[model samples]
Target: GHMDTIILRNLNPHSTMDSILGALAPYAVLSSSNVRVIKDKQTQLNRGFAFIQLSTIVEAAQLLQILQALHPPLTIDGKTINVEFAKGS
Candidate 1:
């Protein structure tokens, strides 16, 4: 299984579910079914994060490129949000 998908993280430390979804929506079609999100601000004081499984490897790579180009999108918790590949980057 050569499933290639991008992992989007470093969202606003104080971000809401909507913001996280918005940041990732640019790459591919996301829904409650296809995409999964997790927020632990209250417990970890960490930035928001999520994993998105694309429909194809090509789509995953393209999505990663786009995220890398922008990076963090904006500052969060007084820190610049970080974005990188889950493992290979």
Candidate 2:
């Protein structure tokens, strides 16, 4: 088993770190501290995407199902959040 970096997109520009973490807890197993939202260096606002680390590839596979179950566009606080595997960067 290995960890996987999942990419989250279309986040609310004003989404708080706590809110993002909260949205993740029910979907997968991992420490909240492991989730990171991409931010603007100057304004410190969310850049509409984030990266979350899952404990194992198995967990990631499982999460894929739950996320795909509702495909009209996932939302948090009325902001859309899209999920996908992170590209090496």
Candidate 3:
């Protein structure tokens, strides 16, 4: 099967690739190239979402569970992040 790509929404505008990756580091090992914080061309800031490609579907599922189980939930720059499998992944 192909690698699973998950969508992260409601990210803070200040969220950067490094920050986002760091948040998930404890849950899974992800390649830097596979993580992207979609940025606005004009503002050069994140558009409040990101996409992370996981090594496998199993890893993706585990990450989601761990994130959701957090006491205050997984947050970056003061915003709670939402994660889900990308469409058609």
Candidate 4:
């Protein structure tokens, strides 16, 4: 598929799916259903990481470009978040 997956990491423990979406909202229109935050089994809290799948590679490219243009990178709850193409994408 031409869909693109973006990896989001180093998220603050307090970060939520909505916050993650808000961070990327400037670059694309991503549905909450398509954003997944890896959670811990015991606490059921986000494990400092997440994934988002875009509808197309073109959107993905735009996301990457916006992220790359940032001088200090994006952050959630004061933690510097990393964004990259998912492995094997």
Candidate 2 weakest ten by summed lDDT: 67-76
Off by over 4 Å in 3: 1-3, 70-72
Q: Compute each candidate's TM-score over C-alphas.
A: 0.54, 0.70, 0.70, 0.71
Query: How high is the lDDT of residue 83 in model 3?
Result: 75
Task: Quantify all predictions' global Cα lDDT against the true fold.
Answer: 0.55, 0.67, 0.69, 0.70
Q: Write one digit per residue (lDDT tens) for candidate 1, span 1-89.
A: 21554555655545554555556556566666654445454575433555666667676766665764764555545544444444542
Clashing pairs in 2: none
Q: How far is candidate 3 from the true structure (C-alpha RMSD, Å)?
A: 3.0
After superposition, the stretches of candidate 2 with alpha carbons farther than 4 Å from their true spots are 1-3, 67-74
- Candidate 4 to native Cα RMSD, angstroms: 3.0
Ranking by TM-score: 4, 3, 2, 1
Which structure among the candidates has the greatest TM-score? 4
lDDT of 3 by residue, 1-89 (tens): 32476678886777666766767556556757666677788987877767777767777767677766655566667877777666762
Candidate 1 stretches with Cα past 4 Å from truth are 1-3, 38-48, 67-72, 76-79
**Candidate 1 vs candidate 3: which has greater TM-score?**
3
